[PDB]
Design an enzyme around this catalytic site. Structure first.
Site, PDB file in Angstrom:
ATOM      1  N   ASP A 181      -2.470  60.550 101.243  1.00 25.20           N
ATOM      2  CA  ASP A 181      -1.759  60.622 102.659  1.00 25.20           C
ATOM      3  C   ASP A 181      -3.404  60.452 103.990  1.00 25.20           C
ATOM      4  OD1 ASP A 181       0.501  61.969 102.150  1.00 25.20           O
ATOM      5  OD2 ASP A 181       0.230  63.633 103.122  1.00 25.20           O
ATOM      6  N   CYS A 215       3.151  48.872 107.687  1.00 29.97           N
ATOM      7  CA  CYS A 215       3.175  51.205 107.297  1.00 29.97           C
ATOM      8  C   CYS A 215       3.937  51.817 108.289  1.00 29.97           C
ATOM      9  CB  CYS A 215       1.176  50.799 106.615  1.00 29.97           C
ATOM     10  SG  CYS A 215       0.635  50.129 108.374  1.00 29.97           S
ATOM     11  N   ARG A 221      -3.095  49.537 106.747  1.00 32.59           N
ATOM     12  CA  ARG A 221      -2.825  49.239 104.928  1.00 32.59           C
ATOM     13  C   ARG A 221      -1.985  47.992 105.161  1.00 32.59           C
ATOM     14  NH1 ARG A 221       0.408  54.651 103.847  1.00 32.59           N
ATOM     15  NH2 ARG A 221      -1.719  55.864 104.657  1.00 32.59           N
ATOM     16  N   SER A 222      -1.353  47.573 106.579  1.00 29.82           N
ATOM     17  CA  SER A 222      -0.679  46.084 105.990  1.00 29.82           C
ATOM     18  C   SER A 222      -2.132  45.145 106.331  1.00 29.82           C
ATOM     19  CB  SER A 222       0.321  45.924 107.728  1.00 29.82           C
ATOM     20  OG  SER A 222       1.577  46.801 107.360  1.00 29.82           O
ATOM     21  N   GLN A 262      -7.936  48.911 110.454  1.00 30.04           N
ATOM     22  CA  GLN A 262      -8.505  50.633 111.284  1.00 30.04           C
ATOM     23  C   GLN A 262      -9.021  51.529 110.783  1.00 30.04           C
ATOM     24  OE1 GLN A 262      -4.003  51.874 110.385  1.00 30.04           O
ATOM     25  NE2 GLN A 262      -3.932  52.393 113.148  1.00 30.04           N
TER      26      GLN A 262
END
Ligand SMILES: Cc1sc2ncnc(N(C)C)c2c1C
Ligand SMILES: Cc1sc2ncnc(N(C)C)c2c1C
Ligand SMILES: Cc1sc2ncnc(N(C)C)c2c1C
Ligand SMILES: Cc1sc2ncnc(N(C)C)c2c1C
Ligand SMILES: Cc1sc2ncnc(N(C)C)c2c1C
Length: 279
Positions: A181, A215, A221-222, A262
């Site tokens: 998370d 994601c 993440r992508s 990010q």
């Protein structure tokens, strides 16, 4: 430089934030006018994450062709990816319309439906064989065929039917279920194992349309997934594998979708994954 020694030099000098900010300042800025039209407000999850007009995927529709999705075309590596947000309640029928129209063989999901106690994407696939889903707005039917649950990922076999033509296609759903998370995984071993299961399936190969990768926003993440895959392929193709410059590959991919990677921690994780995958 070479990657692994550039890596230890940024760790020892503690300068991940400065390197990441450099990438942010040099990244492309292209218009996203279609994404910002008022009729598309309920088709975007985040107001600050939009596809560029030049690279957006168009739905085969006359009324409204818009989806929050981008084609990332990597010319030297000979790989293409579609990066998209996690589908919204109003966009699950658009999502499967896109998979159908683009001739994709695989969907790669890097998030859980619920994370941090909030919904990160719609439940857009069926959980039981005998309870299929019908998307009336796009005239598609989706059936769960089989499931394989492992410690770090789940693979599903889905049947997508175009109800207009009665044509059917098998879609493979690759679900990485253990990204934490907060932050990034401590080791890239399970993420690399997952990437090589997607490759083995044929989902990334030129005999199919591009893989669909998502994601929650379809950038963090992508971005890590496509950046690691392309860097490893270039290290296999070139005479001098040490010539592959991860920062230059990331800026090339940022020509096609804003914001890929990010955080400075996602940038460090992407270097770790490529270094360990090369061995
Ligand atoms: C095979 C293609 S490409 C394309 N681009 C925009 N609109 C389309 N529609 C809505 C008919 C198409 C079709 C049918
Ligand atoms: C034992 C077999 S055969 C086969 N063919 C296509 N997809 C499959 N998955 C990933 C659900 C399988 C499994 C699990
Ligand atoms: C006989 C076949 S076809 C096929 N396609 C994708 N993945 C596979 N594995 C290894 C999980 C297989 C196997 C074992
Ligand atoms: C025939 C196929 S396709 C495919 N894709 C992902 N996983 C699989 N396995 C091994 C569970 C398979 C199999 C057995
Ligand atoms: C990091 C990993 S896991 C794995 N499993 C099967 N084949 C592989 N190669 C060499 C294509 C790999 C790699 C490179």
């Amino acid at each position: 430089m070479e990657m692994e020694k550039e890596f230890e030099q940024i760790d020892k000098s503690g300068s991940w934030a400065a390197i990441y900010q450099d990438i942010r300042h040099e990244a492309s800025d292209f218009p996203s006018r279609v994404a910002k039209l008022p009729k598309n407000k309920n088709r975007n999850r985040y107001r600050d994450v939009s596809p560029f007009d030049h690279s957006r995927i168009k739905l085969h529709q006359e009324d409204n062709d818009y989806i929050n999705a981008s084609l990332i075309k990597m010319e030297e590596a000979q790989r293409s990816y579609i990066l998209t947000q996690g589908p919204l309640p109003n966009t699950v029928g658009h999502f499967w319309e896109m998979v159908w129209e683009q001739k994709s063989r695989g969907v790669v999901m890097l998030n859980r439906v619920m994370e941090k106690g909030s919904l990160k994407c719609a439940q857009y696939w069926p959980q039981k064989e005998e309870k299929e889903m019908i998307f009336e707005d796009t005239n598609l039917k989706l059936t769960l065929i089989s499931e394989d649950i492992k410690s770090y990922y789940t693979v599903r076999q889905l049947e997508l039917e175009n109800l207009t033509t009665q044509e059917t296609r098998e879609i493979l759903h690759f679900h990485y279920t253990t990204w934490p998370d907060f932050g990034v995984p401590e080791s890239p071993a399970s993420f690399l194992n997952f990437l090589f299961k997607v490759r083995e399936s044929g989902s990334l190969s030129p005999e199919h349309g591009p893989v669909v990768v998502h994601c929650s926003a379809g950038i963090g993440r992508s971005g890590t997934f496509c950046l690691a895959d392309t860097c490893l392929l270039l290290m296999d193709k070139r005479k001098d594998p040490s010539s592959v410059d991860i920062k230059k590959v990331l800026l090339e991919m940022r020509k096609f979708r804003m914001g890929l990677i990010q955080t400075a921690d996602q940038l460090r994780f992407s270097y770790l994954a490529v270094i360990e995958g090369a061995k």
